[PDB]
Short mmCIF file of C-alpha atoms and ligand atoms in Angstrom, two decimals:
data_model
loop_
_atom_site.label_atom_id
_atom_site.label_comp_id
_atom_site.label_asym_id
_atom_site.label_seq_id
_atom_site.Cartn_x
_atom_site.Cartn_y
_atom_site.Cartn_z
CA UNK A 10 -3.87 56.46 14.87
CA UNK A 11 -5.46 54.68 11.90
CA UNK A 12 -3.73 55.41 8.61
CA UNK A 13 -6.03 57.19 6.18
CA UNK A 14 -6.40 55.91 2.65
CA UNK A 15 -4.53 57.85 -0.07
CA UNK A 16 -5.80 58.81 -3.48
CA UNK A 17 -5.72 55.92 -6.04
CA UNK A 18 -3.43 55.92 -9.06
CA UNK A 19 -4.44 54.19 -12.33
CA UNK A 20 -2.16 51.33 -13.36
CA UNK A 21 0.65 52.08 -15.83
CA UNK A 22 -0.03 51.34 -19.49
CA UNK A 23 3.62 51.48 -20.56
CA UNK A 24 4.11 49.32 -23.69
CA UNK A 25 6.41 46.32 -23.37
CA UNK A 26 8.30 43.98 -25.71
CA UNK A 27 4.79 42.83 -26.68
CA UNK A 28 2.36 44.97 -28.70
CA UNK A 29 0.54 48.14 -27.71
CA UNK A 30 -2.24 45.87 -26.58
CA UNK A 31 -0.12 44.88 -23.50
CA UNK A 32 1.11 46.76 -20.39
CA UNK A 33 4.28 46.31 -18.34
CA UNK A 34 3.79 45.44 -14.64
CA UNK A 35 5.97 47.84 -12.67
CA UNK A 36 8.45 45.92 -10.49
CA UNK A 37 7.45 47.49 -7.21
CA UNK A 38 4.05 45.90 -7.77
CA UNK A 39 5.44 42.33 -8.14
CA UNK A 40 5.70 40.42 -4.88
CA UNK A 41 7.64 37.14 -4.77
CA UNK A 42 6.58 34.84 -1.83
CA UNK A 43 9.04 32.01 -1.51
CA UNK A 44 7.72 28.81 0.03
CA UNK A 45 9.29 25.33 0.30
CA UNK A 46 7.13 24.40 -2.65
CA UNK A 47 8.11 27.26 -4.96
CA UNK A 48 7.53 30.95 -5.63
CA UNK A 49 4.14 32.65 -5.46
CA UNK A 50 4.08 35.84 -7.61
CA UNK A 51 1.52 38.57 -7.06
CA UNK A 52 0.64 41.78 -8.96
CA UNK A 53 -0.33 44.60 -6.55
CA UNK A 54 -3.08 47.00 -7.45
CA UNK A 55 -2.68 50.66 -6.27
CA UNK A 56 -5.61 51.66 -8.44
CA UNK A 57 -7.96 50.03 -5.96
CA UNK A 58 -6.07 49.93 -2.68
CA UNK A 59 -3.05 52.30 -2.74
CA UNK A 60 -2.82 52.59 1.01
CA UNK A 61 -2.58 48.81 1.44
CA UNK A 62 -0.12 48.47 -1.40
CA UNK A 63 2.17 50.98 0.10
CA UNK A 64 1.93 49.28 3.53
CA UNK A 65 2.55 45.83 1.98
CA UNK A 66 5.67 47.17 0.14
CA UNK A 67 7.03 48.73 3.39
CA UNK A 68 6.60 45.45 5.25
CA UNK A 69 8.19 43.40 2.43
CA UNK A 70 11.15 45.79 2.13
CA UNK A 71 11.49 45.68 5.97
CA UNK A 72 11.64 41.84 5.81
CA UNK A 73 8.64 41.76 8.20
CA UNK A 74 7.16 38.70 6.43
CA UNK A 75 10.34 36.60 6.35
CA UNK A 76 9.91 33.42 8.34
CA UNK A 77 6.26 34.11 8.93
CA UNK A 78 3.51 31.51 8.47
CA UNK A 79 0.33 30.83 6.59
CA UNK A 80 -1.15 30.16 9.95
CA UNK A 81 -4.71 29.85 8.93
CA UNK A 82 -5.68 27.77 5.88
CA UNK A 83 -9.13 26.40 4.98
CA UNK A 84 -9.36 24.18 1.84
CA UNK A 85 -11.46 25.63 -0.89
CA UNK A 86 -11.71 28.94 1.04
CA UNK A 87 -8.55 31.03 1.68
CA UNK A 88 -4.88 30.81 2.68
CA UNK A 89 -4.18 33.37 5.38
CA UNK A 90 -0.80 34.42 6.64
CA UNK A 91 1.13 37.37 8.20
CA UNK A 92 2.80 38.38 11.47
CA UNK A 93 0.01 36.88 13.52
CA UNK A 94 0.43 39.58 16.09
CA UNK A 95 0.02 43.34 16.76
CA UNK A 96 3.03 45.45 16.09
CA UNK A 97 3.38 49.15 17.03
CA UNK A 98 5.45 49.55 13.87
CA UNK A 99 2.43 48.59 11.75
CA UNK A 100 -0.76 50.41 12.86
CA UNK A 101 -4.15 49.54 11.23
CA UNK A 102 -5.25 50.99 7.88
CA UNK A 103 -8.49 52.60 6.68
CA UNK A 104 -10.38 50.04 4.60
CA UNK A 105 -10.09 50.32 0.83
CA UNK A 106 -12.99 48.09 -0.24
CA UNK A 107 -14.12 50.09 -3.31
CA UNK A 108 -13.25 53.15 -5.38
CA UNK A 109 -15.13 55.93 -7.20
CA UNK A 110 -15.94 55.02 -10.79
CA UNK A 111 -13.88 57.32 -13.02
CA UNK A 112 -14.83 58.76 -16.40
CA UNK A 113 -11.42 57.56 -17.70
CA UNK A 114 -11.92 54.00 -16.50
CA UNK A 115 -11.98 51.72 -19.49
CA UNK A 116 -14.00 48.78 -18.14
CA UNK A 117 -14.60 45.84 -20.43
CA UNK A 118 -18.12 44.76 -19.59
CA UNK A 119 -18.80 41.04 -19.51
CA UNK A 120 -22.04 40.60 -21.53
CA UNK A 121 -23.62 37.70 -19.61
CA UNK A 122 -25.06 37.24 -16.19
CA UNK A 123 -23.38 37.30 -12.79
CA UNK A 124 -24.79 35.91 -9.56
CA UNK A 125 -23.64 38.65 -7.20
CA UNK A 126 -23.52 41.90 -9.22
CA UNK A 127 -25.56 43.61 -11.99
CA UNK A 128 -22.43 44.66 -13.79
CA UNK A 129 -19.10 42.83 -13.91
CA UNK A 130 -16.07 43.02 -16.21
CA UNK A 131 -12.40 43.83 -16.38
CA UNK A 132 -10.14 46.85 -15.63
CA UNK A 133 -6.47 46.68 -16.43
CA UNK A 134 -6.40 42.92 -16.18
CA UNK A 135 -8.36 42.69 -12.95
CA UNK A 136 -11.86 41.30 -12.48
CA UNK A 137 -14.31 44.05 -11.33
CA UNK A 138 -17.86 44.84 -10.37
CA UNK A 139 -19.30 48.33 -10.72
CA UNK A 140 -22.40 50.45 -10.66
CA UNK A 141 -23.19 54.11 -11.57
CA UNK A 142 -20.95 55.42 -8.86
CA UNK A 143 -18.45 52.77 -7.66
CA UNK A 144 -16.10 50.01 -8.72
CA UNK A 145 -14.59 47.18 -6.77
CA UNK A 146 -12.35 44.11 -7.18
CA UNK A 147 -14.02 40.59 -7.28
CA UNK A 148 -12.98 37.87 -4.80
CA UNK A 149 -12.17 35.50 -7.74
CA UNK A 150 -9.70 32.70 -7.05
CA UNK A 151 -6.06 33.73 -6.61
CA UNK A 152 -6.82 37.23 -5.27
CA UNK A 153 -4.83 38.90 -2.55
CA UNK A 154 -6.71 40.72 0.17
CA UNK A 155 -6.24 42.01 3.72
CA UNK A 156 -7.63 40.11 6.75
CA UNK A 157 -9.37 42.31 9.31
CA UNK A 158 -11.47 42.26 12.48
CA UNK A 159 -15.20 43.16 12.63
CA UNK A 160 -14.49 46.94 12.64
CA UNK A 161 -13.65 47.91 9.02
CA UNK A 162 -10.47 49.88 9.83
CA UNK A 163 -8.60 47.07 11.60
CA UNK A 164 -6.59 45.48 8.75
CA UNK A 165 -3.03 46.17 7.85
CA UNK A 166 -0.51 43.26 8.35
CA UNK A 167 -2.19 39.94 7.77
CA UNK A 168 -3.45 38.96 4.35
CA UNK A 169 -5.22 36.10 2.64
CA UNK A 170 -5.22 34.51 -0.87
CA UNK A 171 -8.52 33.09 -2.14
CA UNK A 172 -8.44 29.39 -3.04
CA UNK A 173 -11.81 29.65 -4.73
CA UNK A 174 -14.22 32.46 -5.44
CA UNK A 175 -15.61 34.14 -2.34
CA UNK A 176 -17.84 36.79 -3.97
CA UNK A 177 -19.85 37.40 -0.80
CA UNK A 178 -16.85 39.18 0.61
CA UNK A 179 -17.01 41.80 -2.14
CA UNK A 180 -17.20 45.41 -0.96
CA UNK A 181 -16.45 44.32 2.60
CA UNK A 182 -12.73 43.63 2.35
CA UNK A 183 -9.63 45.27 0.92
CA UNK A 184 -8.52 43.42 -2.13
CA UNK A 185 -5.15 44.70 -3.32
CA UNK A 186 -3.54 42.01 -5.54
CA UNK A 187 -3.87 38.96 -7.74
CA UNK A 188 -1.73 35.83 -8.12
CA UNK A 189 -0.03 35.81 -11.53
CA UNK A 190 2.17 32.74 -10.97
CA UNK A 191 2.52 29.86 -8.52
CA UNK A 192 -1.12 29.43 -7.64
CA UNK A 193 -0.47 25.67 -7.48
CA UNK A 194 1.91 26.29 -4.51
CA UNK A 195 -0.81 28.17 -2.62
CA UNK A 196 -2.86 24.98 -3.08
CA UNK A 197 -0.11 22.93 -1.54
CA UNK A 198 -0.10 24.98 1.72
CA UNK A 199 -0.73 23.06 4.98
CA UNK A 200 -4.40 23.12 5.73
CA UNK A 201 -6.13 23.82 9.08
CA UNK A 202 -9.62 22.73 10.03
CA UNK A 203 -12.48 25.19 9.67
CA UNK A 204 -14.28 23.65 12.68
CA UNK A 205 -11.09 24.13 14.90
CA UNK A 206 -10.28 27.77 15.78
CA UNK A 207 -11.57 28.93 12.44
CA UNK A 208 -8.87 27.08 10.44
CA UNK A 209 -5.91 28.19 12.51
CA UNK A 210 -3.33 25.49 12.41
CA UNK A 211 -2.94 24.07 15.88
CA UNK A 212 0.10 23.24 18.02
CA UNK A 213 2.23 21.11 17.86
CA UNK A 214 1.85 21.92 14.15
CA UNK A 215 2.55 25.13 12.31
CA UNK A 216 1.59 26.62 8.94
CA UNK A 217 3.96 26.53 6.00
CA UNK A 218 6.64 29.28 6.10
CA UNK A 219 7.01 32.38 4.10
CA UNK A 220 10.75 31.71 3.77
CA UNK A 221 11.27 35.08 2.10
CA UNK A 222 9.17 37.87 0.60
CA UNK A 223 10.64 40.49 -1.80
CA UNK A 224 9.46 42.99 -4.40
CA UNK A 225 10.84 42.47 -7.88
CA UNK A 226 12.11 46.00 -7.67
CA UNK A 227 14.51 44.86 -4.84
CA UNK A 228 16.35 42.63 -7.37
CA UNK A 229 18.82 44.08 -9.76
CA UNK A 230 17.01 44.66 -13.11
CA UNK A 231 18.78 41.77 -14.88
CA UNK A 232 17.29 39.41 -12.28
CA UNK A 233 13.87 41.08 -12.27
CA UNK A 234 10.98 38.94 -13.49
CA UNK A 235 9.51 40.94 -16.36
CA UNK A 236 5.70 40.52 -16.65
CA UNK A 237 3.29 41.95 -19.14
CA UNK A 238 -0.57 41.87 -19.06
CA UNK A 239 -2.96 42.11 -22.02
CA UNK A 240 -4.91 45.44 -22.00
CA UNK A 241 -8.45 44.15 -21.40
CA UNK A 242 -10.10 47.19 -22.91
CA UNK A 243 -8.83 46.12 -26.33
CA UNK A 244 -10.81 44.06 -28.87
CA UNK A 245 -8.15 41.39 -28.79
CA UNK A 246 -9.12 40.48 -25.25
CA UNK A 247 -12.67 39.42 -26.18
CA UNK A 248 -11.24 36.16 -27.57
CA UNK A 249 -10.20 35.20 -24.10
CA UNK A 250 -13.93 35.74 -23.28
CA UNK A 251 -15.52 34.20 -26.41
CA UNK A 252 -13.38 31.03 -26.26
CA UNK A 253 -15.11 30.03 -22.99
CA UNK A 254 -18.56 31.02 -24.01
CA UNK A 255 -18.62 29.68 -27.60
CA UNK A 256 -17.46 26.03 -27.38
CA UNK A 257 -17.81 24.39 -30.86
CA UNK A 258 -15.65 21.36 -30.22
CA UNK A 259 -17.43 18.21 -31.66
CA UNK A 260 -16.57 16.74 -28.29
CA UNK A 261 -19.76 18.45 -27.01
CA UNK A 262 -22.87 16.86 -28.32
CA UNK A 263 -24.78 19.11 -25.91
CA UNK A 264 -23.55 22.63 -26.79
CA UNK A 265 -22.52 24.47 -23.63
CA UNK A 266 -24.38 27.63 -22.74
CA UNK A 267 -22.82 30.84 -24.06
CA UNK A 268 -21.89 31.92 -20.57
CA UNK A 269 -18.71 32.34 -18.61
CA UNK A 270 -18.15 33.11 -14.94
CA UNK A 271 -16.23 36.35 -14.68
CA UNK A 272 -13.88 34.70 -12.24
CA UNK A 273 -13.16 31.93 -14.64
CA UNK A 274 -11.83 34.31 -17.36
CA UNK A 275 -8.06 34.19 -17.59
CA UNK A 276 -6.39 37.47 -18.39
CA UNK A 277 -3.31 36.81 -20.63
CA UNK A 278 -0.24 37.36 -18.43
CA UNK A 279 3.22 36.31 -19.63
CA UNK A 280 6.74 36.46 -18.30
CA UNK A 281 9.00 38.38 -20.69
CA UNK B 11 -19.65 -1.12 -26.14
CA UNK B 12 -20.85 -2.09 -22.68
CA UNK B 13 -24.50 -0.85 -22.59
CA UNK B 14 -25.64 1.22 -19.64
CA UNK B 15 -27.74 -0.57 -16.90
CA UNK B 16 -30.75 0.65 -15.11
CA UNK B 17 -30.04 3.17 -12.33
CA UNK B 18 -30.24 2.09 -8.73
CA UNK B 19 -31.50 4.30 -5.89
CA UNK B 20 -29.07 5.42 -3.23
CA UNK B 21 -29.41 3.67 0.13
CA UNK B 22 -31.46 5.56 2.76
CA UNK B 23 -30.52 3.49 5.78
CA UNK B 24 -30.63 5.65 8.85
CA UNK B 25 -27.47 6.13 10.95
CA UNK B 26 -26.27 7.29 14.31
CA UNK B 27 -27.02 10.83 13.20
CA UNK B 28 -30.76 10.12 12.81
CA UNK B 29 -33.50 9.65 10.20
CA UNK B 30 -32.55 12.90 8.42
CA UNK B 31 -29.28 11.34 7.50
CA UNK B 32 -28.35 8.34 5.30
CA UNK B 33 -25.40 5.92 5.61
CA UNK B 34 -23.16 5.68 2.60
CA UNK B 35 -22.72 2.00 1.59
CA UNK B 36 -19.07 0.89 1.91
CA UNK B 37 -19.12 -0.40 -1.64
CA UNK B 38 -19.76 3.14 -2.82
CA UNK B 39 -16.83 4.63 -0.95
CA UNK B 40 -13.51 4.65 -2.83
CA UNK B 41 -10.24 5.26 -0.94
CA UNK B 42 -7.43 6.65 -3.01
CA UNK B 43 -4.12 6.52 -1.02
CA UNK B 44 -1.57 9.14 -1.97
CA UNK B 45 1.69 10.08 -0.33
CA UNK B 46 -0.16 13.11 1.05
CA UNK B 47 -3.03 11.13 2.55
CA UNK B 48 -6.30 9.50 1.63
CA UNK B 49 -8.82 10.83 -0.90
CA UNK B 50 -12.27 9.54 -0.20
CA UNK B 51 -15.04 9.55 -2.89
CA UNK B 52 -18.75 8.63 -2.78
CA UNK B 53 -19.89 6.79 -5.86
CA UNK B 54 -23.32 7.42 -7.37
CA UNK B 55 -25.09 4.59 -9.09
CA UNK B 56 -28.29 6.68 -9.18
CA UNK B 57 -26.71 8.62 -12.09
CA UNK B 58 -24.03 6.34 -13.55
CA UNK B 59 -24.61 2.71 -12.47
CA UNK B 60 -22.53 1.33 -15.41
CA UNK B 61 -19.43 3.43 -14.62
CA UNK B 62 -19.80 2.67 -10.88
CA UNK B 63 -19.85 -1.03 -11.53
CA UNK B 64 -16.85 -0.69 -13.95
CA UNK B 65 -14.95 1.48 -11.49
CA UNK B 66 -15.64 -1.06 -8.67
CA UNK B 67 -14.48 -3.86 -10.91
CA UNK B 68 -11.20 -2.14 -11.63
CA UNK B 69 -10.63 -1.18 -8.03
CA UNK B 70 -11.21 -4.75 -6.94
CA UNK B 71 -8.91 -5.96 -9.77
CA UNK B 72 -6.20 -3.57 -8.25
CA UNK B 73 -5.94 -2.11 -11.73
CA UNK B 74 -5.27 1.44 -10.39
CA UNK B 75 -2.61 0.48 -7.92
CA UNK B 76 0.72 2.17 -8.70
CA UNK B 77 -0.88 4.31 -11.33
CA UNK B 78 -0.46 8.11 -11.61
CA UNK B 79 -2.37 11.38 -11.67
CA UNK B 80 -0.64 11.77 -14.95
CA UNK B 81 -2.50 14.97 -16.11
CA UNK B 82 -3.17 17.81 -13.70
CA UNK B 83 -3.98 21.45 -14.57
CA UNK B 84 -4.20 23.87 -11.62
CA UNK B 85 -7.75 25.24 -11.06
CA UNK B 86 -9.11 22.79 -13.71
CA UNK B 87 -8.93 19.02 -13.08
CA UNK B 88 -6.64 16.24 -11.78
CA UNK B 89 -6.82 13.27 -14.14
CA UNK B 90 -5.60 9.77 -13.44
CA UNK B 91 -6.12 6.13 -14.41
CA UNK B 92 -4.31 3.32 -16.23
CA UNK B 93 -3.10 5.71 -19.00
CA UNK B 94 -3.12 2.81 -21.51
CA UNK B 95 -5.13 0.56 -23.77
CA UNK B 96 -6.42 -2.56 -21.96
CA UNK B 97 -8.65 -5.18 -23.59
CA UNK B 98 -10.04 -6.03 -20.10
CA UNK B 99 -11.80 -2.67 -19.98
CA UNK B 100 -13.74 -1.94 -23.12
CA UNK B 101 -15.53 1.43 -23.49
CA UNK B 102 -18.91 2.20 -21.80
CA UNK B 103 -22.11 3.76 -22.98
CA UNK B 104 -22.04 7.36 -21.76
CA UNK B 105 -24.16 8.10 -18.64
CA UNK B 106 -24.26 11.86 -18.74
CA UNK B 107 -27.87 12.25 -17.54
CA UNK B 108 -30.92 10.29 -16.37
CA UNK B 109 -34.66 10.54 -16.70
CA UNK B 110 -36.21 12.78 -14.09
CA UNK B 111 -38.40 10.64 -11.82
CA UNK B 112 -41.40 11.70 -9.62
CA UNK B 113 -39.76 9.74 -6.86
CA UNK B 114 -36.72 11.98 -7.14
CA UNK B 115 -36.82 14.27 -4.13
CA UNK B 116 -34.76 17.19 -5.52
CA UNK B 117 -34.24 20.12 -3.12
CA UNK B 118 -34.47 23.15 -5.42
CA UNK B 119 -32.10 26.06 -4.85
CA UNK B 120 -34.32 29.16 -5.15
CA UNK B 121 -31.73 31.57 -6.59
CA UNK B 122 -30.19 32.07 -9.96
CA UNK B 123 -27.65 29.86 -11.71
CA UNK B 124 -25.50 30.86 -14.72
CA UNK B 125 -25.58 27.51 -16.60
CA UNK B 126 -29.02 25.91 -15.90
CA UNK B 127 -32.54 27.16 -15.25
CA UNK B 128 -33.13 24.73 -12.41
CA UNK B 129 -30.47 23.50 -9.95
CA UNK B 130 -30.63 21.89 -6.58
CA UNK B 131 -29.66 18.84 -4.64
CA UNK B 132 -30.57 15.08 -4.86
CA UNK B 133 -29.41 12.71 -2.12
CA UNK B 134 -26.51 15.06 -1.21
CA UNK B 135 -25.30 15.63 -4.79
CA UNK B 136 -25.53 18.89 -6.81
CA UNK B 137 -27.83 18.50 -9.76
CA UNK B 138 -29.48 20.29 -12.66
CA UNK B 139 -32.70 19.30 -14.22
CA UNK B 140 -35.43 20.23 -16.70
CA UNK B 141 -38.83 18.78 -17.67
CA UNK B 142 -37.34 15.48 -18.87
CA UNK B 143 -33.83 14.88 -17.46
CA UNK B 144 -31.55 15.35 -14.49
CA UNK B 145 -27.75 15.57 -14.34
CA UNK B 146 -24.88 15.98 -11.90
CA UNK B 147 -23.11 19.33 -11.80
CA UNK B 148 -19.40 19.69 -12.28
CA UNK B 149 -18.87 21.37 -8.93
CA UNK B 150 -15.44 21.28 -7.33
CA UNK B 151 -14.47 17.87 -6.02
CA UNK B 152 -16.62 15.83 -8.46
CA UNK B 153 -15.38 12.51 -9.91
CA UNK B 154 -16.06 11.92 -13.68
CA UNK B 155 -14.96 9.68 -16.44
CA UNK B 156 -12.50 10.94 -19.11
CA UNK B 157 -13.45 10.13 -22.75
CA UNK B 158 -12.64 10.89 -26.36
CA UNK B 159 -14.79 13.09 -28.69
CA UNK B 160 -17.15 10.17 -29.43
CA UNK B 161 -19.54 9.89 -26.40
CA UNK B 162 -19.15 6.12 -25.84
CA UNK B 163 -15.36 6.05 -25.37
CA UNK B 164 -14.95 6.47 -21.63
CA UNK B 165 -14.42 3.68 -19.09
CA UNK B 166 -11.00 3.58 -17.41
CA UNK B 167 -9.48 7.02 -16.79
CA UNK B 168 -11.11 9.56 -14.55
CA UNK B 169 -10.80 13.21 -13.36
CA UNK B 170 -11.44 15.19 -10.20
CA UNK B 171 -12.54 18.74 -10.62
CA UNK B 172 -10.39 21.31 -8.78
CA UNK B 173 -12.85 24.07 -9.47
CA UNK B 174 -16.27 24.24 -11.01
CA UNK B 175 -16.36 23.17 -14.70
CA UNK B 176 -20.05 23.65 -15.44
CA UNK B 177 -19.53 23.95 -19.18
CA UNK B 178 -18.91 20.15 -19.11
CA UNK B 179 -22.35 19.42 -17.70
CA UNK B 180 -24.51 16.97 -19.73
CA UNK B 181 -21.45 16.01 -21.86
CA UNK B 182 -19.59 13.73 -19.47
CA UNK B 183 -20.28 10.84 -17.13
CA UNK B 184 -20.13 12.19 -13.55
CA UNK B 185 -20.26 9.31 -11.11
CA UNK B 186 -18.91 10.47 -7.75
CA UNK B 187 -17.95 13.28 -5.37
CA UNK B 188 -15.07 13.78 -2.96
CA UNK B 189 -16.14 13.45 0.68
CA UNK B 190 -12.72 13.66 2.32
CA UNK B 191 -9.15 14.61 1.45
CA UNK B 192 -9.86 17.27 -1.14
CA UNK B 193 -6.82 19.09 0.13
CA UNK B 194 -4.63 16.17 -1.03
CA UNK B 195 -6.08 16.46 -4.49
CA UNK B 196 -4.91 20.08 -4.43
CA UNK B 197 -1.37 18.96 -3.44
CA UNK B 198 -1.05 16.72 -6.55
CA UNK B 199 1.91 17.46 -8.82
CA UNK B 200 0.80 19.85 -11.51
CA UNK B 201 1.49 19.66 -15.21
CA UNK B 202 1.43 22.61 -17.65
CA UNK B 203 -1.69 23.21 -19.75
CA UNK B 204 0.36 24.64 -22.64
CA UNK B 205 2.52 21.49 -22.70
CA UNK B 206 0.82 18.34 -23.85
CA UNK B 207 -2.54 19.41 -22.36
CA UNK B 208 -1.28 19.31 -18.81
CA UNK B 209 0.23 15.86 -19.09
CA UNK B 210 3.24 15.69 -16.72
CA UNK B 211 6.47 15.44 -18.63
CA UNK B 212 9.52 13.14 -18.19
CA UNK B 213 11.66 13.00 -16.05
CA UNK B 214 8.84 14.04 -13.78
CA UNK B 215 5.91 11.90 -12.94
CA UNK B 216 2.43 12.48 -11.60
CA UNK B 217 1.87 11.56 -7.96
CA UNK B 218 1.12 7.92 -7.45
CA UNK B 219 -2.18 6.34 -6.43
CA UNK B 220 -0.33 4.07 -4.11
CA UNK B 221 -3.46 2.05 -3.58
CA UNK B 222 -7.14 2.31 -4.51
CA UNK B 223 -9.72 0.34 -2.54
CA UNK B 224 -13.41 0.21 -1.80
CA UNK B 225 -14.27 0.53 1.88
CA UNK B 226 -16.26 -2.76 1.47
CA UNK B 227 -12.91 -4.52 0.90
CA UNK B 228 -11.98 -3.75 4.58
CA UNK B 229 -13.21 -5.50 7.69
CA UNK B 230 -16.28 -3.78 9.16
CA UNK B 231 -14.55 -2.13 12.10
CA UNK B 232 -11.86 -0.70 9.87
CA UNK B 233 -14.40 0.60 7.36
CA UNK B 234 -14.79 4.37 7.42
CA UNK B 235 -18.51 4.99 8.27
CA UNK B 236 -19.86 8.09 6.55
CA UNK B 237 -23.30 9.64 6.83
CA UNK B 238 -24.86 12.39 4.64
CA UNK B 239 -27.71 14.71 5.46
CA UNK B 240 -30.84 14.08 3.48
CA UNK B 241 -31.11 17.14 1.30
CA UNK B 242 -34.87 16.82 0.94
CA UNK B 243 -35.32 17.53 4.61
CA UNK B 244 -35.96 20.92 6.20
CA UNK B 245 -32.70 20.73 8.21
CA UNK B 246 -30.74 21.10 4.93
CA UNK B 247 -32.03 24.65 4.31
CA UNK B 248 -29.65 26.10 6.91
CA UNK B 249 -26.63 24.82 4.92
CA UNK B 250 -28.10 27.00 2.11
CA UNK B 251 -29.44 29.95 4.08
CA UNK B 252 -26.28 30.21 6.27
CA UNK B 253 -24.45 31.30 3.13
CA UNK B 254 -27.20 33.43 1.67
CA UNK B 255 -28.26 35.32 4.80
CA UNK B 256 -25.18 36.74 6.50
CA UNK B 257 -26.30 39.12 9.19
CA UNK B 258 -23.00 39.44 10.95
CA UNK B 259 -22.21 43.18 11.55
CA UNK B 260 -18.73 42.21 10.20
CA UNK B 261 -20.34 42.82 6.86
CA UNK B 262 -21.12 46.57 6.68
CA UNK B 263 -22.25 45.87 3.12
CA UNK B 264 -24.69 43.02 3.57
CA UNK B 265 -23.98 40.38 0.94
CA UNK B 266 -26.61 39.56 -1.63
CA UNK B 267 -28.92 36.70 -0.64
CA UNK B 268 -27.48 34.31 -3.23
CA UNK B 269 -25.22 31.20 -3.22
CA UNK B 270 -23.67 29.36 -6.08
CA UNK B 271 -25.10 25.83 -6.06
CA UNK B 272 -21.46 24.50 -6.14
CA UNK B 273 -20.59 26.52 -3.03
CA UNK B 274 -23.24 24.79 -0.87
CA UNK B 275 -21.70 22.26 1.52
CA UNK B 276 -23.79 19.19 2.09
CA UNK B 277 -23.34 17.98 5.66
CA UNK B 278 -21.23 14.89 5.39
CA UNK B 279 -19.65 13.35 8.50
CA UNK B 280 -17.44 10.48 9.60
CA UNK B 281 -19.03 8.67 12.55
MG1 MG C 301 -15.03 28.19 -8.24
#
């Protein structure tokens, strides 16, 4: 029995210690992956993939990922990890590769070209593509998505983090999170070889361990890492875009083009 | 200021792989030994002969041995070098671009690019060009020379791109590409971009370049022999079209027939 996708919920816009131009990340949507290198922190996105977020939370709370491995890692591509097995406790999910575009959705359009989509921009701090009917998350670097088999509804336990942009995967995979801290540790993960079992790390060697995985909500509040994200629908966010397009430093005797790759735009995200 | 010399064409000596491949000359292979493993880089005197010669001189003088990747910003660049003033190594004239030659056999990428009107490949390197000039692209895993605001101030300290930094194109001397050990570059100790521009702070130190050598400094049978596919040949198109045309039923939404010039992998093999 494949688990059907539930209805999406827009991300909370609760004001934080910062101005009304920022939103609090809810603690249940913060995942802390502890590796020997340090902690990888991820913001989950139930606005695009509520079914996968719920599943991920369940597995994390159930300690299902503790001691598991990033068993498949290809440099410059993705770092993939999970239970590396089928478990009757965790049946497959319906794919959540895109969502209906809603009238309430406040997308900040990026007013320069993109190679893969006619329209790209930002929605609640996440990079997105959209058309008249649909919206989807972009496979920018540091995005969390669910691995699957050829049939779309086969994902549900094993995930990957993008090491570089993989835009060709857009609208074919369930993206349900983004890295907000510790991306450097993802980059330290033991690599496999793409020409050997598709990057699966081979015996006698094993991928680096997920020593523990928790939700911030599992910690007592006074130990919870408090994160806030700039609201990308505000005028203040444009600077984060115009700083990369308009480069006036005398360093440049050849003025750079007024263009920025949507996946290079950094959304202000701060620990509070 | 050391003036820039005339560019020199890359060797097209055929290898074990055949006439559609070229051997990389050992003098144009740099081996950076880290605690993680070896980073190998192919130098490009076709674009930056002056910087290549300088870099070769410093490597042979063992000037980089025991030095650090002292400035590293995740997703940006890993910068290393002597991190000091040295009278032995005066600044070089910038080599940020070269005249486009009719003899240049550029393989044009026939899809859009965000930063340049024409992009493609020249002797296994990503390039941009117009009517008059050609330049190397700041794709990931490219080696370039750090400098100050004045163009002719580079010459000792270099950086390796961790991700594409195309906005730097035509403003910096790019003079090499990583051909092996990119994963080790990604393991390098990081600094913090909001603290001294990513310079790693005491008591911590950047990871050490334990040794830096040219392959040519080794005896022939210990030299790593690398060959690169000639990008002007028809065989190279697959490396492009494999990523543009994805017909696998895995994709129920067929990807657009487009590839970022910096995502194209030029066949490069150890033999
Ligand atoms: Mg990139």
